[PDB]
């Protein structure tokens, strides 16, 4: 089945764009990445940077994740990100999101060898 690293790339990476270009970016991406297939995933963040730059966060500043695990890392640099959050109108299967652009540090949890992101914890 899909690996945790691969799920991370499918859920959170968008190296193909530098930012969200319209209010419909979230609607579009939540659906095309299959995050609305079984239910409407409530919130999601997309990272508009190279995969290698995101992977590299795994060797940046350690910080405990929200849930207390000690394998979270905060990026040294801010990154172009898009935050997606359901609209009051969102109703499965018609999942609907508000797209918000931001430039923030990301916090990810990493695992494996290679040691790579497997969970998006927060933008700060």
Positions marked active-site: 12, 119
Residue with tokens 């009051």: 88
**Which residues line the annotated binding site?**
7, 10, 41-45, 66, 85
**Residue 93 to residue 23: CA distance in whole angstroms:** 19
Task: Judge contact between 13 and 51, C-beta under 8 A.
Answer: yes
Q: Cite the annotated binding site for substrate by residue number.
A: 7, 10, 41-45, 66, 85
Question: For residues 61 and 74, is the Cβ–Cβ distance under 8 A?
Answer: yes
């Amino acid at each position: 089945k899909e690996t945790a690293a691969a799920k991370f790339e499918r859920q959170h990476m968008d190296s193909s764009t530098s930012a969200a270009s319209s209010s419909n970016y979230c609607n579009q991406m939540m659906k095309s990445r299959n995050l609305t297939k079984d239910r409407c995933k409530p919130v999601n963040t997309f990272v508009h940077e190279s995969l290698a730059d995101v992977q590299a966060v795994c060797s940046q500043k350690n910080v405990a994740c929200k849930n207390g695990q000690t394998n979270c890392y905060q990026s040294y640099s801010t990154m172009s990100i898009t935050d997606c959050r359901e609209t009051g109108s969102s109703k499965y299967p018609n999942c609907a999101y508000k797209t918000t652009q931001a430039n923030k540090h990301i916090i990810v949890a990493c695992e494996g060898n290679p040691y790579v992101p497997v969970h998006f914890d927060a933008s700060v």
